[PDB]
Every structure is written in C-alpha cells, then in structure tokens.
C-alpha cells in the first residue's frame with residue numbers, strides 16, 4: 175500500500191490546440207500551430223488541429239468524464255488568439271466565455287482548475303512581429319496574462335505561465351519540428367531568454383492582480399544516464415534539456431555553466447541585464463517527465479545510445495526511476511517550495527477490443543510504476559503536491575498528428591465517441607484510494 179498525503183491533487187492534463195478544434199470559431203485569430211500544420215510537410219499525414227477531439231463543442235461531456243472518474247484537478251490551457259485575436263489590444267468576449275463556462279463547470283463539480291497560460295499556440299499576428307524572438311513579447315505576454323488574471327483570477331487560483339519553454343525555443347526555432355518551424359540557433363537562444371523575461375513579467379503582474387492564488391512554470395525533463403564511466407555529457411544534457419536552463423536564472427540569476435559553455439555566443443550580449451527581473455519569485459515548479467536516455471560524448475557533442483529497454487509507440491524508453499530522480503534532483507538543486515508532476519503518460523497502439531473496451535495494460539503498468547516512484551520521492555521529503563496524467567483524451571500530438579494516443583480515454587475520431595480505457599478506470603481507483611495498493 176502506497177498512500178499519498180492528505181489532499182494530494184490527482185489530475186489529468188490537456189492543451190487547447192491538441193483537443194479543441196474550431197481554431198477560427200467565434201472571432202479567434204489564427205495561431206502559429208494553425209499556419210504550421212496547414213503548411214504541407216510539417217505534420218505527419220497532413221493532420222491539423224481543425225477538428226481534433228472537438229472539445230470546443232464537447233467540453234461539458236469531457237468534464238463530466240473527469241467528474242465521473244473522480245479526478246480532482248484538471249490542467250488545461252488557454253488559446254491566446256481566442257482571447258486576443260491579434261495577440262495584443264482587442265479582447266474577444268466569446269473566447270473568454272468559452273473558458274469561463276469550463277472554469278465554472280469544474281468549480282461546480284469540485285474539480286480544481288490548473289491553467290496553463292501558454293501551451294504553444296502563439297497568435298500568428300505576433301509571429302509576424304518575430305514571436306518569441308522579439309524582446310517586446312515580454313510586454314505582449316504580460317498584457318495577455320493580465321487579461322486572464324482580471325477575468326478568471328477570482329475563480330482560478332493555480333496558474334502556469336509557460337509549458338516547456340525549452341521545447342518552444344529549441345524544437346520550434348532550432349530544430350524547426352514545431353511551430354513556427356525555424357532553424358536558427360541565435361533565434362532559438364533569444365527565444366529562451368525572452369521566454370524567461372515574459373514568464374517573469376507575467377508573475378509580476380500576477381502579484382499585482384490576483385492577491386490569492388499561486389503561479390509557477392512547467393519544464394520538460396529526461397533522465398539521462400551515461401553510456402560509460404560521458405558523465406559530463408549527462409551533465410550538459412541535464413543543464414540544457416532539463417529544468418536548470420530556466421531555474422538557474424530564476425533561483426541563481428544566470429544560465430547553467432555548461433549551457434554558457436555551449437551557447438554564450440548565441441545569447442544577447444547584455445543578457446545579464448535582465449537576470450534580476452527574471453528572479454521574480456515563483457510559487458511552484460511543474461515537471462513533466464516521460465522518458466530516459468543513454469547519452470555519450472560524441473565529437474552539441476552529445477548523441478543518444480539506443481538501449482534494449484521497453485519503449486512506447488513514440489520510441490521512448492520506459493524508465494520509471496527517472497521520475498524519482500528528477501524529483502530528488504530538483505529539491506537538491508533549487509529546493510522549490512512546491513513541485514507538481516504536471517505531465518506523465520505514454521503512447522501505445524490502443525485498440526478497441528470486441529468487448530467494447532481498451533485493454534491498455536501497457537499504459538496501466540507505465541503509470542503504476544511512475545506513480546510508485548513519485549510516492550518514493552514524497553517519502554524522502556520532496557514537496558510534491560499533485561500529479562497530472564497526460565492526457566485525459568487521445569488528441570493531436572503536434573508533428574505526429576493523430577498517430578499517437580496518450581489518453582486514458584480513447585477517442586474515435588470518426589464519431590468523436592469517448593471510450594474510457596482500462597487505464598482511466600485504473601486511475602480512477604488510484605484517485606479514490608488516494609494511492610496504490
């Protein structure tokens with residue numbers, strides 16, 4: 175038996191562009207994911223977020239599913255261009271209405287909203303002005319965040335500025351695999367820095383606008399192990415790809431040492447001028463975790479080494495101890511007052527059996543193991559307050575399109591039927607029992 179603390183927050187997570195569809199409904203402006211996915215060659219099968227899970231229409235049903243499952247918290251994101259169609263200036267009341275209904279419904283049903291302010295769907299109008307490359311985005315983002323706080327901060331008390339700013343900057347602007355689809359290292363590092371500045375401005379506005387309530391930021395993380403006794407290659411991957419890239423500025427006022435070794439010439443010349451503002455106090459750290467990687471020096475001077483370990487449909491190695499490690503490691507390095515696991519989950523080739531059920535034992539096994547390791551971290555003093563499964567629903571998985579199913583609820587895209595998977599049922603029992611048995 176592994177029981178979690180009193181009032182531990184069991185959650186599920188989604189993101190606006192991945193689930194909503196109707197990207198241009200009710201006066202919404204285009205996002206960069208709209209234009210990126212409508213550009214041939216960018217997303218597998220030419221898939222787009224035009225329909226997705228049709229949550230824009232089916233939101234009440236989906237929340238009733240969260241309620242029926244007894245899940246205590248819902249992490250979801252707000253589409254910036256639904257709220258401010260040109261990114262700044264005009265506010266769209268119908269966009270606010272959409273999230274207002276979701277928020278009120280969750281509260282009526284006793285479910286705690288955790289709002290991700292930015293989960294990657296930047297207004298296209300701001301991308302035309304350079305998007306995350308433009309220092310002025312700290313202002314645009316602060317203006318956007320202020321609107322959300324003013325409209326929803328009376329009810330929503332748990333906020334996340336950014337989802338995975340490493341991905342936004344590096345996968346979006348260096349690898350070019352995500353919107354806005356650029357390959358320029360100097361742009362990517364100016365995006366890193368502006369994401370920090372925008373995050374801090376938003377926190378500053380939050381303090382001025384929402385007297386009660388807490389704000390944090392979410393990072394992607396991998397568990398990197400060295401191929402041999404290489405150890406430095408692991409050091410660099412941790413500092414670059416994990417929370418330190420952002421938390422070293424937030425807590426210590428500079429980028430991590432090995433990030434500066436690699437990337438100093440790509441940062442703005444006077445980037446330290448911004449660091450004291452970047453240290454704006456945050457209330458919690460959200461860590462996302464999915465996978466581990468064997469890593470070797472390789473003349474970024476790092477390559478991955480494939481291991482014969484179980485993998486998900488993403489090809490990601492399943493390494494549950496990784497979630498324990500990253501929780502320990504965050505406490506050891508920065509000691510944030512609260513931590514949440516804001517995403518953990520797996521993609522498998524889900525099939526609806528003849529019995530009408532989805533027998534995803536592989537996903538149950540994956541979740542159980544990671545929930546077990548999170549439990550461990552708590553016993554050793556990590557202030558983990560909640561854990562969010564990615565995802566409530568199968569959805570549009572960015573450049574993979576619909577080909578990767580992460581839900582604990584199966585979505586038949588031909589009918590939009592939701593079928594709760596065995597993992598959703600299993601999870602509901604975990605939540606009801608406040609832990610594993």
Ligand SMILES: OC[C@H]1N/C(=N\O)[C@H](O)[C@@H](O)[C@H]1O
Nearest residue numbers: 189337338394462517564580
């Ligand atoms: O890959 C599954 C999810 N994992 C994520 N980061 O690792 C993203 O936040 C989320 O939007 C999904 O892409």
